[PDB]
Amino acid sequence: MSKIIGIDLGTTNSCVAVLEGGEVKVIPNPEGNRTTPSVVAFKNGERLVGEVAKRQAITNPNTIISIKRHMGTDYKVEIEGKQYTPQEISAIILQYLKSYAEDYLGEPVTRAVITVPAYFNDAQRQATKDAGRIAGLEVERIINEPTAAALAYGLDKEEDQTILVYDLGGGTFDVSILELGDGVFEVKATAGDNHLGGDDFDQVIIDYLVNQFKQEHGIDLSKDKMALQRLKDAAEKAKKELSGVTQTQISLPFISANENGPLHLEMTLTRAKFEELSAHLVERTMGPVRQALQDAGLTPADIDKVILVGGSTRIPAVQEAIKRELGKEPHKGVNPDEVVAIGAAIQGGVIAGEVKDVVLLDVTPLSLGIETMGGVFTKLIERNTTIPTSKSQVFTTAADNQTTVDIHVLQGERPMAADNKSLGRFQLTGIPPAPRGVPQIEVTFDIDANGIVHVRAKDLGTNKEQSITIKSSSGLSEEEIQRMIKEAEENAEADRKRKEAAEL
């Protein structure tokens, strides 16, 4: 039966993870990348999704970007006179992800756990549950992104605590305060900016570039789709490189043309210059963090953990800003581009891991024991004990100078030996003379997996032993077993038999 893939169906990107072995694995798509653009293009009647669709987003007029902003709305996109709902376009993305998860698994995947923003309403959720179904997936669970991220860090396996997840994606900014209470998360606060994301950090670069070009050649590249698409792609690639390097080259040869021929755009962009251009974007990120603290009635001190989610969280200036705002070192331990999908796959594994199957197990049908001074039944192995089993009890002599002890093995539930079934008898002889209660005879009952019991009596000081395989015709089976099992609680109370404190 199918696995439950974890799906992060994001505004800019989507990611799918699955639990295989005992580890969560992020599934690479057809071209080897772990995240695929959440965009669909209808070029020539063929539905394109992923990078191939994003590569022509500026160039192609019917290309659908961030359709997630629509979900749960009666919005309609029209391509060549045909209307599609957000559920339908979300389904296409959905179908892609499911497909490549099947390639990777080498088997059909028909179940999933889909992730959504903590603030999605019923309409919004339902729209993504419906998208899953259109795509052919049984949506086992709709969990929210902040929680999925917490799951990826295994926070639900820890002590009660307050968590702040700072989520900066390609198009939106979300901050959620989660309070873990006895392994269960609760969203205390939510705040954000649904128009603050990596795309905007992109937009600063693109603007700086076309302006230098506007003042150096009097040409506005933002008016040429082909030039713009080249700019968009290059502005994003440069932003990313600036996350691990302080200097980078934006090289756009044959970008345009004038009276004298081809024009080339070449220029080195430093981290410092990029940070300068986007400093306002980084500050717009602080308000939602404070409003969320206010709503929860908290202060940076009440937050035990800050978690980072979103690819834009990789930006050095962004990490330094929340580090300074909260006074805590952010957790980036798990890939911020995959953290949500990873938490969804853990939940999927948990759902898929539920077993309700029963296993047969042999247990002792009645209490087993030995007769003890005064006609009382002394049990060694209680009723309903799992076999194989082995129990040992040390017994002693009743009178001064015993030589011998009679081991009478019984099976039943009542206190006096006379009311139980006799299973066998043997005796240990040659016990060195000693005062009463001084010699130590260890009797051990050993039951093998087939229910046969073997009794041994061993003089611990001498090491001489005797034993027998108490043994079937072994006596009781069907009725007799239940007849005695009732009758013992029934006639209860010659448990008066504590009259047997025939004392000493």
Ligand SMILES: Nc1ncnc2c1ncn2[C@@H]1O[C@H](COP(=O)(O)OP(=O)(O)O)[C@@H](O)[C@H]1O
């Ligand atoms: N190394 C990086 N440095 C800065 N930004 C990055 C890096 N890698 C990806 N990003 C940005 O992360 C954003 C995508 O965020 P992500 O969490 O993948 O998306 P979504 O909003 O769909 O959930 C994009 O704007 C991308 O350019």
Ligand SMILES: [Mg+2]
């Ligand atoms: Mg996201």
